Amino acid sequence: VSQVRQNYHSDCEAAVNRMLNLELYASYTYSSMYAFFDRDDVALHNVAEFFKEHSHEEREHAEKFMKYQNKRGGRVVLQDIKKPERDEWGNTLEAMQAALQLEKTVNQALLDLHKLATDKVDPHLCDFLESEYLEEQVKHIKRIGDFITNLKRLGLPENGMGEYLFDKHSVK
Amino acid sequence: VSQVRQNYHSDCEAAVNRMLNLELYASYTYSSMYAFFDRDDVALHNVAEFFKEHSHEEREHAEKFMKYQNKRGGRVVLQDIKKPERDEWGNTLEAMQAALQLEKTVNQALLDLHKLATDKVDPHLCDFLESEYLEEQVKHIKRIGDFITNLKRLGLPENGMGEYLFDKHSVK
Amino acid sequence: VSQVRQNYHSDCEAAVNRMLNLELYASYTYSSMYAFFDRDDVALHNVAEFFKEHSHEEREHAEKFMKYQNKRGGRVVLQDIKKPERDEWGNTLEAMQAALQLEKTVNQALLDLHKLATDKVDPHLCDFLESEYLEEQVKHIKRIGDFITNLKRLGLPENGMGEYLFDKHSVK
Amino acid sequence: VSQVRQNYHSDCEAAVNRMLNLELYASYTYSSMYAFFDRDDVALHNVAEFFKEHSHEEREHAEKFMKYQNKRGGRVVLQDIKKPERDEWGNTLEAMQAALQLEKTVNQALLDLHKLATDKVDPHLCDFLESEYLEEQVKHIKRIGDFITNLKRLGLPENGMGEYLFDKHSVK
Ligand SMILES: [Cl-]
Ligand SMILES: [Cl-]
Ligand SMILES: [Cl-]
Ligand SMILES: [Cl-]
Ligand SMILES: [Cl-]
Ligand SMILES: [Cl-]
Ligand SMILES: [Cl-]
Ligand SMILES: [Cl-]
Ligand SMILES: [Cl-]
Ligand SMILES: [Cl-]
Ligand SMILES: [Cl-]
Ligand SMILES: [Cl-]
Ligand SMILES: [Cl-]
Ligand SMILES: [Cl-]
Ligand SMILES: [Cl-]
Ligand SMILES: [Cl-]
Ligand SMILES: [Cl-]
Ligand SMILES: [Cl-]
Ligand SMILES: [Cl-]
Ligand SMILES: [Cl-]
Ligand SMILES: [Cl-]
Ligand SMILES: [Cl-]
Ligand SMILES: [Cl-]
Ligand SMILES: [Cl-]
Ligand SMILES: [Co+2]
Ligand SMILES: [Co+2]
Ligand SMILES: [Co+2]
Ligand SMILES: [Co+2]
Ligand SMILES: [Co+2]
Ligand SMILES: [Co+2]
Ligand SMILES: [Co+2]
Ligand SMILES: [Co+2]
Ligand SMILES: [Co+2]
Ligand SMILES: [Co+2]
Ligand SMILES: [Co+2]
Ligand SMILES: [Co+2]
Ligand SMILES: [Co+2]
Ligand SMILES: [Mg+2]
Ligand SMILES: [Mg+2]
Ligand SMILES: [Mg+2]
Ligand SMILES: [Mg+2]
Ligand SMILES: [Mg+2]
Ligand SMILES: [Mg+2]
Ligand SMILES: [Mg+2]
Ligand SMILES: [Mg+2]
Ligand SMILES: [Mg+2]
Ligand SMILES: [Mg+2]
Ligand SMILES: [Mg+2]
Ligand SMILES: [Mg+2]
Ligand SMILES: [Mg+2]
Ligand SMILES: [Mg+2]
Ligand SMILES: [Mg+2]
Ligand SMILES: [Mg+2]
Ligand SMILES: [Mg+2]
Ligand SMILES: [Mg+2]
Ligand SMILES: [Mg+2]
Ligand SMILES: [Mg+2]
Ligand SMILES: [Mg+2]
């Protein structure tokens, strides 16, 4: 094994690689959302830029797992980054609903990794998750849920005026 | 009696303690409103922060009565702070309507204390009320009444778009 | 359930509401202590201001739990804030002794919530407790215990000169 | 009558002159206290300077009544300023006790003037009293009462060390 490796279970190493892939997948989904809202027949630029920012954040999350893996003496193993589920995202409400579910999927995988880390008695991995990932997921989920509530209040999907207002006053 | 006490009737001392409790009660009600508007299924953050600011203001009003009591040689006597009337506040209009009534309740109690102070020939307590409390109540009542008028104009409770617009352009 | 809720047990939600109430209770107790030391027949202003600062800190702790509850998709449920145990606090030593016990009561409730969070496999709630509450309790308990030791050394309760010296050189 | 005079009763004019004299009397008493604490066989300089500052404040209070009288179209009528009650003031405790009573005497005369102003339906004089005098008396009385409490705690009159400590840590 690596000269640095200490208290790092093979199962945790593998799960970190799988989580890295999911972070990359999330990044790629958000890129798709950005591109959709930048279309000339969609044209909600503030919405598009929200999703672009999230794409960048997810890619950073992936980089941080690569660094983590190496610090522990594990080995980064990459897999294909699957294309997003959809090619088109409907409207701001549908997209935010998809984003909420994505963030919850990410969160569940982080929680599952934390449970594995617990089971393997790996406090360093627990700490990393708790300090760098779990709170940010709660914040994202809350923000996107708040947006959904507001989009519903604004009459989405039918109310175009409401959609316009959201883009111009919410997506700060 | 206290070495400092001069021209301070026992009835006024007791009424100051009761008023302190009401200020605390008002603070607590506004906290409830803050929490409600911060819910993910409510999500009117500017509204929530208006109510949080008012909660803080009411707590300051209570502190000022504690200090007043001691300055006059009275004795602070605390009672339980009753929980708010409601657990949930409906929407911005209902909440503002409740706030208006709360502010009027507070005002009436301040006015009643001023009448007692008058009857007991306590110009210092009259002055304190007039200089630190009575005008601020008039301002609050006016502001919240103006908000109500605007929420009605905006089509509350039914018009969600109107509610959104209020949160984004009024609650400065 | 709330659209945001994920891995948040009903028991933990309820326990967060109970803890919020205890934080508020602690705030209110410290306010009483402030008022007592501000009395003209007590007149230990630095002591009074220590307790006022702690009252404000506890209220902030309560606010942070309200925000936490909403972030997780729980619902803030308020109860009455019970008045403090005592109306008068004796002297600096007795008050500090009461404060120590209050801080220990708060701490025990935080520790119990952490155990519940552990049992329910809620690492986010564990982290929140560990990062925002548990260390601050240890610091408070240590500070107040150190004060007690010094008040005893200074001859409290009988030695008034010692009490004066403490107010003028310790309560920074 | 004076061309300016409006709603100013002769009784109120006379009472303002009497109050002016009392302010001057209070100033003179505090000067005596200053001189006593500056004696080489007393030598409590911070105490002395507290009393000197109060002497100056009382003289300012007197000047403000002279200006008030002229503004209303009354006529300043001066009387002798009686020498203080005592030539020597014992110690810090006795002096503070005398100061408390002086401040209460001043306050009672202000309150009596306010009652006369009320009876004569003179809101301008009421306002002047409330805005420029009555609160400052409450503050002085509270401060001096707090000092007394501390001097007693410090073992005055017998405890010289306590008296020294008060001069060096209280009279800010
Ligand atoms: Cl290993
Ligand atoms: Cl292994
Ligand atoms: Cl992108
Ligand atoms: Cl598609
Ligand atoms: Cl849709
Ligand atoms: Cl985080
Ligand atoms: Cl009285
Ligand atoms: Cl009475
Ligand atoms: Cl609040
Ligand atoms: Cl309700
Ligand atoms: Cl309604
Ligand atoms: Cl005011
Ligand atoms: Cl859940
Ligand atoms: Cl549950
Ligand atoms: Cl307080
Ligand atoms: Cl008691
Ligand atoms: Cl004791
Ligand atoms: Cl902490
Ligand atoms: Cl006239
Ligand atoms: Cl006349
Ligand atoms: Cl002088
Ligand atoms: Cl004499
Ligand atoms: Cl004496
Ligand atoms: Cl004043
Ligand atoms: Co991520
Ligand atoms: Co990067
Ligand atoms: Co842990
Ligand atoms: Co983020
Ligand atoms: Co108030
Ligand atoms: Co405050
Ligand atoms: Co205000
Ligand atoms: Co606390
Ligand atoms: Co706060
Ligand atoms: Co602290
Ligand atoms: Co004066
Ligand atoms: Co002058
Ligand atoms: Co003054
Ligand atoms: Mg090797
Ligand atoms: Mg392996
Ligand atoms: Mg495929
Ligand atoms: Mg941690
Ligand atoms: Mg953190
Ligand atoms: Mg937000
Ligand atoms: Mg007494
Ligand atoms: Mg009474
Ligand atoms: Mg009840
Ligand atoms: Mg005013
Ligand atoms: Mg206005
Ligand atoms: Mg729902
Ligand atoms: Mg439940
Ligand atoms: Mg009870
Ligand atoms: Mg920490
Ligand atoms: Mg220390
Ligand atoms: Mg003429
Ligand atoms: Mg005349
Ligand atoms: Mg004579
Ligand atoms: Mg004033
Ligand atoms: Mg003071």
Side-chain angles (χ1 to χ4, degrees), chain A residues 142 145-147 149-150 153-154 159 161-162 165-167 169-170, chain B residues 38-45 159-161 163-165 168-169:
Chain A
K142 179 60 162 63
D146 288 353
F147 285 164
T149 296
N150 279 279
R153 160 184 296 123
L154 281 163
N159 197 320
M161 181 178 292
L165 286 168
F166 177 88
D167 172 89
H169 305 80
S170 290
Chain B
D38 180 68
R39 288 169 53 156
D40 80 86
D41 62 358
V42 184
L44 295 159
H45 291 292
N159 197 320
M161 181 178 292
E163 190 168 20
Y164 178 86
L165 286 168
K168 296 301 186 176
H169 305 80

Side-chain angles (χ1 to χ4, degrees), chain B residues 5-8:
Chain B
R5 197 187 190 105
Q6 181 172 34
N7 194 42
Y8 193 50

Side-chain angles (χ1 to χ4, degrees), chain C residues 141-153:
Chain C
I141 289 165
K142 179 60 162 63
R143 188 159 191 216
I144 297 162
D146 288 353
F147 285 164
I148 294 164
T149 296
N150 279 279
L151 291 155
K152 291 177 171 183
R153 160 184 296 123

